[PDB]
Ligand binder design. Structure first.
Ligand SMILES: CCC1=C(C)/C(=C/C2=NC(=C\c3[nH]c(/C=C4\NC(=O)[C@H](C)[C@H]4CC)c(C)c3CCC(=O)O)/C(CCC(=O)O)=C2C)NC1=O
Ligand SMILES: CCC1=C(C)/C(=C/C2=NC(=C\c3[nH]c(/C=C4\NC(=O)[C@H](C)[C@H]4CC)c(C)c3CCC(=O)O)/C(CCC(=O)O)=C2C)NC1=O
Ligand SMILES: CCC1=C(C)/C(=C/C2=NC(=C\c3[nH]c(/C=C4\NC(=O)[C@H](C)[C@H]4CC)c(C)c3CCC(=O)O)/C(CCC(=O)O)=C2C)NC1=O
Ligand SMILES: CCC1=C(C)/C(=C/C2=NC(=C\c3[nH]c(/C=C4\NC(=O)[C@H](C)[C@H]4CC)c(C)c3CCC(=O)O)/C(CCC(=O)O)=C2C)NC1=O
Ligand SMILES: CCC1=C(C)/C(=C/C2=NC(=C\c3[nH]c(/C=C4\NC(=O)[C@H](C)[C@H]4CC)c(C)c3CCC(=O)O)/C(CCC(=O)O)=C2C)NC1=O
Ligand SMILES: CCC1=C(C)/C(=C/C2=NC(=C\c3[nH]c(/C=C4\NC(=O)[C@H](C)[C@H]4CC)c(C)c3CCC(=O)O)/C(CCC(=O)O)=C2C)NC1=O
Ligand SMILES: CCC1=C(C)/C(=C/C2=NC(=C\c3[nH]c(/C=C4\NC(=O)[C@H](C)[C@H]4CC)c(C)c3CCC(=O)O)/C(CCC(=O)O)=C2C)NC1=O
Ligand SMILES: CCC1=C(C)/C(=C/C2=NC(=C\c3[nH]c(/C=C4\NC(=O)[C@H](C)[C@H]4CC)c(C)c3CCC(=O)O)/C(CCC(=O)O)=C2C)NC1=O
Lengths: 39, 160, 59, 161, 161, 160, 161, 160, 161, 160, 160, 161
C-alpha cells in the first residue's frame, strides 16, 4: 500500500491574467464570469 | 498558430518551452509542406467546391433558397454565397495554420450576433459547411480529408 | 460619477516571477466613493499617483 | 501576441484574398528555419542561468552600480535587476521561437520606458547589458541562432527607448 | 446624473431658496410632455432591433466598410459595430425619457470620440449612419417624439465631435 | 426623480425601461399636478409651520435652549433654527421632486456626524422634525398630509 | 515611510560609510526630544476630537462655504470636510512624534493636490483651516509641542501648495 | 502524458480537444513504440549509465564527495547515487510519457526547498544530470539521444 | 487527473522500479488503442449537440418530466438539464481519450449526487438519460469505440447513482 | 525602526498609538544612548572584526577558499571580505535602529536570489555571519552583546 | 497582553517573533511588578474614586441626572454608575496587561451602538471618564499615574 | 484571543470582580518567567532550520516514508512535510512565548487531525516527528526553557493523536 503522486496534487487550477488585446481577452472575460459567478 | 497557442500557455506559466511543447512545434515544421499542399489544393478547387456545396445547401434548406427566405432572389443568394466563400477562405487559412484560432478570430467571434443581424438561419449555414466537408473528402486524400474534416468540424461548431 | 486615476506601485515586498509590469504601472477608473479607499490603499502600498482625473462632467 | 504564420494570415485577411504563392513561399521559409530555431530555444533554456550569470558579470560586476549609491547597491535591487534581465531573455527567447517580434514588443515593450523612468533604472545601461547578453547568447547558441537572437535583441534595444 | 426636475432642484439648492414658481411651471410642462414621450419611448423599445437593422441596411450593407479591411470587416468587428449602435440607441432612449441628455453625455459620450479615434473607427461615418437612424426613428415615433429624438441625435452629433 | 431612479436601475440592467416601471412613471406624470399644488401650499405656510415647530421643540427640550445646551444663547438658538429651516426647505424640494433619494443625496447623509460636530442632540433634532411634520399635516390636505408624512418619516429615520 | 533614525540610516547607506559621530549627534537629538514628544503626542491623542471641532469652527463658523453653493454646503460635503482634516491631523501627529515628515508627504500629500484640483475644493481654505488646527493644537499641547506640530502643519501647508 | 497535458488545457478552455491537440496525441500514439524502445535501452544500461555519471559529477565538483562535503562518506555517496537514480527513473518515465508532466510532479516541484533543507548542493545535482545526459547520448542512437537529451534538458533546467 | 500511460507510470513509481515488461505491455495497449480513441473523439465533437438531443428525446422528452412540475418543465430548467448532460458528455469524452476514470472522479462526480439530491432533481432520471446518451454515442462512434465510451459513461452514471 | 513599525500599524488603524505602543516608543527613546554606545564600539573595531571573522569562516568552511570555490584567489577573497563588511555595517545600522526592519530593507530581501546567482554558497555566507557574531560577543559587553546577537541572529535566519 | 498583540501581528505576517517584539516582551515583564502594583492601588481605591468621579460628572452634566436625562431618577442614575464601575474595572485590567487590547475586547467594540440604543449621552460619559482620570491621577503615585493616565486617555478617546 | 495574562483577565472579567490576590500571583509568575521564555524563543528562531533538519534526520528520514510510496517519496510531499514541521514549530514557539496552550489549539490544532486523515498523512509519523523536534528543541533551548517548550510541543502532539 503505497500512495501515488495523486494524493492532493491536482487541486490547483490555471490562472487567467489580462494582456494585450486579442481574442484571448474574451477567454479571460469568460473566466471572470465563470468564477465570480458560478456558471 | 500551433506555436502561438503553445507559447501562450508557456508564457502564462512563465516557463521556457517544455520538451514536449518544443516537439509539437517540430512536428508542425515537419508536416508544414503537406499542410501547404492540402491548402493549395483547396484554393485550386475553391470555385468548383463553392458551386457544388451551394447546390447541396439549397436542397437541404429550400425555404432560405426560395423567395421568402434569407437568400430570396439572385442578389440575396449571391450575397449569401459570398459570405460562404469568405468562410471557405478562412477554413483554408486555418487548415494551413494547423490551429483553428485564426479562423475563430475571423468568423467565430460574435457569429451568432452577425447571423441574427442578417436574419439568416445558422443551421442552414452549418449544413452548407457539411456539404463543403463532403466535397473536400472527394477532392482530398484520406489522411488529408481527416484533418480537413476536423477543421471543418470546428467550423460546424462555430456555425452552431 | 467616477474618476480616471493612474498610479504606479513598486512591488518591493514580492519580487514576482510572473509578469507584473501591468500591475506595476496601471491606469484605472474608480467610482468617486471608491476613490477614497483606493487612494488610501495605493498610499498604503506606497505607489505614486501619476494622475487623478474626473470622467464625470460636473465637479 | 502574433507569430510569423499569424502575420502572414493577418496580411491575407487584410487583403481579403486566399494565400498567394509568394506568401506561401514565405511560410515555407519559416517552416524551414523552424527546426534550427526550436533546437536553439532548447539550448537557451538549458544554459539560461549561465547566460544570465555571464552577462550580469560583464555588465555590472565590480562597478559603481554595485557600489553604494549605484542603484544596484541593495540586495533587493540586485535580485530585481536579475529578475528583469531574466524576463527580458525569456520573453525574447519565446519571440525567437515564434520568428515574429510583435509578441515581444506588445507583451514586454508596452509602457516599459515609463515604468523604468518611474523606477529610475538606467535604460541605456540595461541596453548595454542586453547587448552583452546577446553576444554571450550568440556564442553559446551558434552563428545561425545568434543572428536571429541578435535581431530580437535589437528590437528589445529599440523598445528600451 | 441629473433628472430634469433634479436639475431645477439643484439650481434652487445652489440659490438657497425654495424652487421658483417659474421652475415649477417648467416641471409641470415637462410632466405634460413626458406622458407623450413615454408612450413613444415604449414604441421605440419594442422596435429597437428593427430600427438598428434598418440603419445598418441603409449604410453598412453592401459597403466598403463591409469589404475586407474596412474596420467593420470582421465577425468581432461586425458584432461590436451593431452593439455600439444599439447601446447608443438605448442611452438615447433613456435621455429622451428623462428630458435631459446629461446622463448620455456623462457616460456614453465620456471620451467615446477619443476612444473611437484611437481605435480608428470612422466617427463621422458612424454619425451619418446615426443621423439616418434618427430620421427613421423620428418618423416612426412621431413629430413630437421626433423632436426629443432630435435632441438625442444632437447629443450624438456632439459625440461625433 | 423617481423616473430617474427607475432609469438608473434600467441602465444597470442594460435593457429598456420595464413595462410596470413605465406605467409608474406615467402615474407620476399625473401625480405631478397634485404634488405641485400641495408643495405650493406647504411653501406658503412654511414660515408659520417653522415658528410653531420651533416653539414645540423648545417645549420638548428646554435644557437645549437653556444654558448648558446646544441652543444655549440667542446665537446658538438662531443657528439651530436656521438648520431646521434649511432641512424644511430641503424636505419641500424632495417632496416636489417625488424622489426621496434626491433629498438623501443633498442632505441627511452623514447628518449624524454633522450633528456631532455641531454638538446638538440628534434625538432633539428628530423631535423638532416631528413637530414640523404635525404642523405640515394640518396645513396640507389629507391626501397631501399622507405624502408629507412619508417624507417626514424618511427624515425621522435619517435623524435616528 | 521614514523616521529620524531611518532617514539618518538612509543617508549613511547611500554614502556607504560607517556610523558617523555627527549622525550620532542628530540621532541623539531625536532620542532626547523623543520623551517630551511622546508625552505631547499622548495629549494630542486625548484631545484630538476637541481640536478638530475647534479648528472646524474657526475656519467654518456660519461660513459661506457652509451656505448653499459654497462647496461644503451639504451633509455629505460637511462630513467629508470634517473627515479630511481629521485624517490630516492624525497623520501629522504621527509625523511630529516620529520627527520625520517624509512619511506624511508620501501617505497624505501624494495625490491629494490632484484630487483636490479635480474636486475643485479650495486648497487655500483648507490651508486656513489647517493653520487654525495648528494654533489650537499648539495651545492644547503646549509651546514646545506646538513647535513640532507647527513643523508638521507647515508640511501640510506645503502639500496644499 | 502529452494527452494529459492537452486534457488539462482543454478542461481550462471548457472546450473539446482541439483538432491540432488531437493531432499531437496521434503523433504520441505513433511514437509510443520508439519512445518505449529508447526507455528500454536506458533501463537496460541503468547501472553503468549512472555509475559513469557519478564519477563524472564527483570529478567536476570534488567537494561534493570530499571531507566536509554533503556526500562525504560511503553511505552518503550511495544516497547521492540514489538521488541521481531517482532522477534517471523519472527521465525514463518522462520519455515514455512524451511530456514533462511525469517529471514535474516528481522531483521538479519544491525540489529546491527539499535539497536546501537537507544541505545537498543544487548546482552540483544539476551537473550530475548533465553528466547523465552525456552518458545517455553515448549509449543511445543519434535521434534517440536528441529526444532523450530534450527530456534530460528539462530536468536540468528545473534544477536551476 | 490521470491517463493510461500516466497511471501506469504512477504505479511504477509507487513500486519504485524502472519500467518492467508488464509496464511495457500495459503502456503498449494504450498505444495501440490511441488510433481508435482519437477517431472516436473527433466524431463525438462533431455530433456532440445531436447526441444530447437524441438522448433526451429517447429518454426524457415527451414525458411527465417535461410536462409541468417535472423538474424540466421550464425554459431555464430545460436549459440547465441540457447543460448538465453536455457537461457529463464532454468530461466523459475527455476521460475516454485519457483511458482512466481519475478525470471523471476529480471533476465530474465530485459532490454531484448531494447537490442533485438537495435540489430535488431525480438521480434515476439522470441515470436513464446517461444510458440513453451512451447508446447514441456508441452508435455514432462505432463498435470498438462504443465499448470504451460505455466504460467511461458507466463510471459517471454509477457515481451519480 | 521601532517608531517605523508603530507608524505602519498606526497608518492602517488611522488611530493614535495606544499606551502600550507609546511605551514601546519610550523604551526605544530610553535606550537610544545604549544603542549609540554599542554602535560606537562596533564601528571602532569594525575592520579588526572583519579580518578575524574571515579567518574563522575560512577555517570552518575551507571549501569556499579552496580551488574551485567562489573565493579562490586574492581578488575573490577581497570581494568576500567586502561583502562581509557590507553585512556587518548593515547590522550596525539595524542595531542603531533597534529593529531588524532597516537591515531587512537594505538587504536580505532577495539575498538568496542574488548570492545564488553570483555562485557563492549561501550556507558559507551564513557561517561567516555567525563568525562575526562570535567576534562581536568577544569584543562587546554581555548586555550590548545580547541586543547585537539578536540582530545578528535575525540576519542568520534570513540567510537560512 | 502586549506580547499577545505582537504575537498576533507576527502570526499574520507568517514570521517568527521579531527581536524588537521580544524586547518589548522583556521590558513589559520587567515593568510588570510595578504595573500590577499600580493596578492593585487603583482597585483598592476604586470605590472612593468612583464616588468622587460620579459627583463630579453629575456636577458637569446636571441635566443627565435631572428628569429628561438618561439617568433620570435614582434607579437610572444607579444603572449609569454601575456601567461606569464596570468600565473602571476594565481599565484596571488593561493597565495591568500593558496593552489596551483587554479593555478593547471588554468594551469600546460596538459601544457606540450600545449607547445609541440606550440613549445615554456619549459626551457626558466621556466627561465622566475624564473626571475619574483626574481624580485617579491625584490618587496614584506620579510614576503609576503616568501609565494610568495613558490608559485612561485611550478610554477617553474611545468614548469620544 | 487567549494568552496567559489575557486568560487570567478574561476569567476575572466573567466574574466581574476586581483583581484577586490569586490572579495577581498567577500574572506575577507569568511576568517572572517571561525572561527565560523570551531568550529561548529567540534561540529557537535563529536555529529553526537546523532543528527541522535534525528532526527529520532523527525520525522521518532514511525510512519507508521517504522511500517510494511513503507519502514523502516525491519532492512535493517532502517540501510540504518540512514546511508542516516548520509551521508546527513556528506556532508552537508563538504559543510558548504567550505561555498559554490555547493559541495552538485555536490555529494549529483546529481541524488539523481531520485534514491529515483526509490527505493520508500518517498521524503517528507526524507525532513522532513532533517528538523528535521536542528533543532537538530541548537540546538547543536548554533544560529550563526546553521543559516549558516541551509542554506546549506535547500539547500539539496530543491534539494530533
Ligand atoms: C549591501 C548589501 C549587498 C551585498 C551583500 C552585496 C553583495 C555582492 N557580492 C558580490 C560578489 C561576490 N560575493 C562573494 C561572496 C562570498 N564568496 C565566498 O566564498 C564567501 C562564502 C562569501 C562571503 C563571505 C564572492 C566570491 C563574489 C565575487 C564573485 C565573482 O567575482 O566571480 C557582488 C558583485 C561584485 C561587486 O560587488 O561588484 C555583490 C554586489 N551587494 C549588496 O548590495
Ligand atoms: C514583461 C517583463 C517585465 C519587465 C521587463 C519588467 C520590468 C520591471 N522591473 C522592475 C524593477 C526593477 N528593475 C531594476 C533593474 C535594474 N537595475 C539596474 O541597476 C540594472 C541597470 C537593471 C537590470 C538590468 C531594479 C533595480 C528594480 C527595482 C526597483 C525598485 O522598486 O526599487 C519592476 C517593478 C516591480 C518589480 O519589483 O518587479 C518592473 C515592473 N516587469 C516585467 O513584467
Ligand atoms: C469575415 C467574417 C464575416 C462574414 C462571414 C460576414 C458576413 C456577412 N453576411 C451578410 C449578410 C447576409 N448573409 C446571408 C446569409 C445566408 N442567407 C441564407 O439564406 C443562407 C442560409 C446563408 C449563407 C449560405 C444573407 C442572406 C445576407 C444578406 C442579408 C439581407 O440583405 O437580407 C453581411 C452584410 C451584407 C454585406 O456583406 O455588406 C455580411 C457583412 N461578415 C464578416 O465580416
Ligand atoms: C442643507 C443641509 C445642511 C444642514 C442641515 C446643516 C446644518 C448645520 N448646523 C450647524 C450648526 C448648529 N445646529 C444646531 C442644531 C440644533 N441645536 C438644537 O438645540 C436643536 C435640537 C437643533 C435644531 C432643531 C446648533 C445649535 C448649531 C450651532 C452650533 C455651533 O456651531 O456652535 C452648522 C454649523 C454652523 C454653520 O452653519 O456654519 C451646520 C453646517 N448644514 C447643511 O449643509
Ligand atoms: C490620506 C488622507 C486622505 C485625504 C486628504 C483625501 C482627500 C480626499 N478628499 C475628498 C473629498 C472631499 N474633501 C472635502 C473637503 C473640504 N471641503 C471644504 O469646504 C473644506 C475647505 C475642506 C476640508 C477642510 C469635500 C467637501 C470633499 C467631497 C467632495 C464632494 O463630493 O463635493 C476625497 C473624495 C472621496 C471622499 O469622499 O473621501 C478624497 C479622496 N483622501 C484621503 O484618503
Ligand atoms: C414552461 C416553459 C416551457 C416551454 C415553453 C417548453 C416548451 C417545449 N417545447 C417542446 C417541443 C417543441 N416545440 C416546438 C416549437 C415550434 N415549432 C415550430 O415550428 C414553431 C415556430 C414553434 C412554436 C410556435 C416543436 C416543433 C417541438 C417538438 C420538437 C420535436 O420533438 O421534434 C418541448 C419538448 C417536448 C416535450 O415537451 O417533451 C418542450 C419542453 N417547455 C417548457 O418547460
Ligand atoms: C461537478 C460538476 C457539476 C454538477 C454535476 C453540477 C450540478 C448542478 N445542477 C444544478 C441544478 C439543476 N440541474 C438540473 C438538471 C436536470 N433536470 C432534469 O430534469 C434532469 C433529471 C437533470 C439532468 C439531465 C436542474 C433542472 C437544476 C435546477 C435548475 C433550477 O431550477 O434553477 C445546480 C444548482 C445551480 C443551478 O441551478 O444550476 C448544480 C450546482 N454543477 C456542477 O458544477
Ligand atoms: C522524487 C524526488 C526525491 C529525491 C530525489 C529524493 C532524494 C533524497 N536525497 C536524500 C539525501 C541526500 N542527498 C544528497 C545529495 C547529494 N550530495 C552530493 O554531494 C551530490 C552533489 C548530491 C546528489 C548527486 C546527500 C548527501 C544526502 C544525504 C544527506 C545526509 O544524510 O547527510 C534524502 C534524505 C535521506 C533519505 O533518503 O531519507 C532524500 C529523501 N527524495 C525525493 O522525494
Amino acid at each position: 500500500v503505497g500512495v501515488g503522486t495523486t494524493r492532493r496534487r491536482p487541486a490547483r487550477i490555471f490562472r487567467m491574467t489580462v494582456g494585450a488585446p486579442s481574442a484571448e481577452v474574451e477567454l479571460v472575460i469568460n473566466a471572470i464570469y465563470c468564477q465570480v459567478m458560478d456558471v | 498558430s500551433v506555436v502561438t497557442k503553445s507559447i501562450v500557455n508557456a508564457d502564462a506559466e512563465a516557463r521556457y518551452l517544455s520538451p514536449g511543447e518544443l516537439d509539437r512545434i517540430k512536428n508542425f515544421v515537419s508536416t508544414g509542406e503537406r499542410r501547404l499542399r492540402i491548402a493549395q489544393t483547396l484554393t485550386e478547387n475553391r470555385e468548383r467546391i463553392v458551386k457544388q456545396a451551394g447546390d447541396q445547401l439549397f436542397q437541404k434548406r429550400p425555404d432560405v433558397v426560395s423567395p421568402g427566405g434569407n437568400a430570396y432572389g439572385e442578389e440575396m443568394t449571391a450575397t449569401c454565397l459570398r459570405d460562404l466563400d469568405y468562410y471557405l477562405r478562412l477554413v483554408t487559412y486555418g487548415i494551413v495554420a494547423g490551429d483553428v484560432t485564426p479562423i475563430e478570430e475571423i468568423g467565430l467571434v460574435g457569429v451568432r450576433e452577425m447571423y441574427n443581424s442578417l436574419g439568416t438561419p445558422i443551421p442552414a449555414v452549418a449544413e452548407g459547411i457539411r456539404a463543403m466537408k463532403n466535397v473536400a473528402c472527394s477532392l482530398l486524400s484520406a489522411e488529408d480529408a481527416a484533418e480537413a474534416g476536423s477543421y471543418f468540424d470546428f467550423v460546424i461548431g462555430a456555425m452552431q | 460619477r467616477m474618476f480616471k486615476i493612474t498610479a504606479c506601485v513598486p512591488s518591493q515586498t514580492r519580487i514576482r516571477t510572473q509578469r507584473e509590469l501591468q500591475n506595476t504601472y496601471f491606469t484605472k477608473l474608480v467610482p468617486y466613493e471608491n476613490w477614497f479607499r483606493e487612494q488610501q490603499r495605493i498610499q498604503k502600498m506606497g505607489g505614486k499617483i501619476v494622475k487623478v482625473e474626473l470622467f464625470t462632467g460636473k465637479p | 501576441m502574433q507569430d510569423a504564420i499569424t502575420a502572414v494570415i493577418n496580411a491575407s485577411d487584410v487583403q481579403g484574398k486566399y494565400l498567394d504563392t509568394a506568401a506561401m513561399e514565405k511560410l515555407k521559409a519559416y517552416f524551414a528555419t523552424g527546426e534550427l530555431r526550436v533546437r536553439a530555444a532548447s539550448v537557451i533554456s538549458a544554459n539560461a542561468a549561465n547566460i544570465v550569470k555571464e552577462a550580469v558579470a560583464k555588465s555590472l560586476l565590480y562597478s559603481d552600480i554595485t557600489r553604494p549609491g549605484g542603484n544596484m547597491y541593495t540586495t533587493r535591487r540586485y535580485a530585481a535587476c536579475i529578475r528583469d534581465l531574466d524576463y527580458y531573455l525569456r520573453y525574447a527567447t519565446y519571440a525567437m521561437l515564434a520568428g515574429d517580434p510583435s509578441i515581444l514588443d506588445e507583451r514586454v515593450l508596452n509602457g516599459l520606458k515609463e515604468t523604468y523612468n518611474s523606477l529610475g533604472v538606467p535604460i541605456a545601461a540595461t541596453v548595454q547589458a542586453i547587448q552583452a547578453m546577446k553576444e554571450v547568447t550568440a556564442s553559446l547558441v551558434g552563428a545561425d541562432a545568434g543572428k536571429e537572437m541578435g535581431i530580437y535583441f535589437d528590437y528589445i534595444c529599440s523598445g528600451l527607448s
